[PDB]
Amino acid sequence: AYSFKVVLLGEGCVGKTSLVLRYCENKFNDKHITTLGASFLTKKLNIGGKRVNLAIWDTAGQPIYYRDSNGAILVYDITDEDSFQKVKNWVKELRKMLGNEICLCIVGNKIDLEKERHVSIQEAESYAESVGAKHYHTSAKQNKGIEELFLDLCKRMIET
Ligand SMILES: Nc1nc2c(ncn2[C@@H]2O[C@H](COP(=O)(O)OP(=O)(O)NP(=O)(O)O)[C@@H](O)[C@H]2O)c(=O)[nH]1
Numbered sequence: 001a002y003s004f005k006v007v008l009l010g011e012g013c014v015g016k017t018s019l020v021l022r023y024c025e026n027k028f029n030d031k032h033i034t035t036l037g038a039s040f041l042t043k044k045l046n047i048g049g050k051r052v053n054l055a056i057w058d059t060a061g062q063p064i065y066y067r068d069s070n071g072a073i074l075v076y077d078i079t080d081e082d083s084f085q086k087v088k089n090w091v092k093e094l095r096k097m098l099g100n101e102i103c104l105c106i107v108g109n110k111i112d113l114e115k116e117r118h119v120s121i122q123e124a125e126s127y128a129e130s131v132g133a134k135h136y137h138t139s140a141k142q143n144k145g146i147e148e149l150f151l152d153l154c155k156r157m158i159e160t
């Protein structure tokens with residue numbers, strides 16, 4: 001019934017692979033196993049009787065990849081201010097290439113490290129709203145908010 005392409009973008013520290021690995025295999029590593037290039041995995045969802053097939057693309061965080069993407073997940077580290085500010089560049093590039101068609105997610109990952117938070121939740125949420133994106137909080141380490149993120153993204157892509 002539905003087939004969607006989703007790309008994860010963000011800096012080297014943020015947890016892109018960790019989000020996908022937790023969602024697809026229910027595994028997590030404290031080790032930073034550096035992603036050397038882009039690749040995709042397939043995840044199947046059944047929402048309202050409707051079969052949704054996701055092509056989830058991972059990228060090396062350190063145009064050809066996000067071409068024809070139905071959704072983009074822009075990941076930052078809540079303990080790293082630089083990683084949040086970097087999200088803004090991605091939004092600009094994606095909106096120039098694809099317009100309002102692409103469903104954007106701005107994702108504050110590592111919420112298990114709330115004690116070490118350096119990104120303003122209010123700034124992040126405000127920014128997300130200003131660019132027509134939705135903001136999400138996740139922890140790949142504790143498996144929090146990930147099911148909700150992908151489910152909501154799928155709902156929004158179906159509604160497009
Ligand atoms: N505490 C905590 N650490 C996390 C979380 N998600 C990822 N990390 C940690 O952040 C580091 C980088 O994770 P990784 O998923 O490899 O990031 P990446 O965005 O794929 N990096 P790259 O672009 O280089 O492949 C690892 O040490 C990993 O354990 C999380 O939710 N909480």
Ligand SMILES: [Mg+2]
Nearest residue numbers: 016017034035
């Ligand atoms: Mg990675």
